[PDB]
Each structure stands twice: as structure tokens, then as C-alpha cells.
């Protein structure tokens, strides 16, 4: 793995140091605290906050009731149609590994070595240069594998 960040402070906002061409991996290892209601990983076009940077891929584990993962895209401060995954591997008080693989037409996400979800590109992945990690989560490491 390349361009590793260890023990970043959350909220984390970081420049992705190369392009997300097909085959590129983003590998995030961390732990979910006991009081977590949600956290999110955002693949952003920049780091503007007003207007809020467009979010090509919002990957949003939620923990209330049975839990789920919500995926969506933010374009000019408007959320698109949510894509919900109900078979969620995340749990409070458990460590995890997220691997986001960039493919031509979509993201593929594996968590803890197991396929979790697909998310079709809504924004060109060439527009992505910024990794945001927010909410109730502890991140141990971030690393990339560029293709
Ligand atoms: C209130 C809140 O937590 N806001 C977050 C924001 O969350 C939204 C996002 O998860 C979308 C995805 O579709 O869903 C929003 O909730 C919807 C419900 O899911 C749905 O059932 C209901 O019908 O409609 C709801 C409203 O649309 C949810 O609020 O996520 C963004 C982007 O990650 C957060 O903004 C980012 O926050 C960080 C700090 O945590 C920084 O400030 C970033 O700059 C900022 O972009 C926002 O806090």
C-alpha cells in the first residue's frame, strides 16, 4: 500500500495523491465506538464547505435498529436517490477493514474480506481528489493502491 496515513484525527479531510483509475484500491482500517449512530466515508470533488463539495460516493454505515449502509451522491448540495444495503457487516465495538475498488462504471466495496456492495458512478471518478471521513469512527490507517 502507498501514501499511508496513520491514526488520523476525525473529522479527516485529505487530498488523494493520485487518480482513481480502474483497479485503484482505497483501504481504510478502523474501529466502531460503542456509542456510534453513524459514520461516513466521502469521495469528494475538492474540500469546499460553502458550497459543500460534491460527493461522488457517500458510504454511510448506520447503526440504529438493525443497521444498514446508505450510499448516495451529492451534487450542488442536493442528495440523489439513496441506495441502501441491509446486509451490513459493521458493528459497534468491532474493528473493520474497508476496501473500495474503483471500476470503470462503479465502485465495488469489500468489508472484512467479503463483498458488500456495488455503487454505479454518478460523477466521473476523475473528479475525485479528496477523502473525507466523518462521524463516530476511529481510523487506524488509510492507504491506496493506484493502477
Ligand atoms: C444530519 C447529518 O448527519 N448530516 C450529514 C449528512 O448526512 C446525510 C446523508 O447521509 C444523506 C445520504 O442520503 O442522508 C441524509 O439523511 C436522509 C435520510 O437518510 C432519509 O431517510 C430522509 O428521508 O432524508 C434525510 C435527509 O436527506 C443525511 O442527513 O452527510 C453529509 C456528508 O457526509 C455531512 O456533511 C459533512 O459533514 C462533515 C462533518 O461530519 C463535514 O462538515 C463535511 O464538510 C460535510 O460535507 C452531514 O453532516
Residue numbers in the entry: 8 to 154
Paper text:
Galectin-8 is a member of the tandem-repeat galectin category, having two CRDs in tandem that are joined by an amino acid linker of variable length. The two CRDs of galectin-8, i.e. galectin-8N and galectin-8C, share ~40% sequence identity and exhibit differential glycan binding specificities. The galectin-8N CRD exhibits a typical β-sandwich comprising two anti-parallel β-sheets with the concave side housing the carbohydrate-binding site. The binding groove is formed from six beta strands labelled S1 to S6, with amino acids on strand S4-S6 forming the glycan recognition pocket (referred to as the “primary binding site”).
The galectin-8N-LNnT complex was obtained by soaking LNnT into an apo-crystal, and the structure was determined at 2.0 Å. The electron density maps showed unambiguous electron density for all the four sugars of the tetrasaccharide, and with the reducing end occupying the primary binding site. The lactose portion of LNnT retains the interactions observed previously in the galectin-8N-lactose complex. The other two sugars of LNnT extend through a β1-3 linkage into the extended binding site of galectin-8N contacting residues on strand S3 and S2. Due to the β1–4 linkage within the non-reducing end disaccharide (type 2 core), as opposed to the β1-3 linkage in LNT, all the four LNnT sugars stay close to the protein surface and interact with both the primary and the extended binding sites. The O6 of GlcNAc interacts with Gln47 and Asp49 and O3 is pointing away from the binding site into the solvent. The non-reducing end galactose ring forms CH-π type interactions with Tyr141 and O2 engages in hydrogen bonding interactions with Asp49. Despite having identical ligand conformation, the orientation of unique Arg59 on the long S3-S4 loop is different in our galectin-8N-LNnT complex to that seen in all the reported galectin-8N apo and ligand-bound structures. In the galectin-8N-LNnT complex, Arg59 is directed towards the non-reducing end galactose, whereas in the other structures, including the galectin-8N-LNFIII complex, it faces towards the conserved Trp86. Overall, the conformation of the LNnT core of LNFIII in the galectin-8N-LNFIII complex, is identical to that observed in our galectin-8N-LNnT-complex.
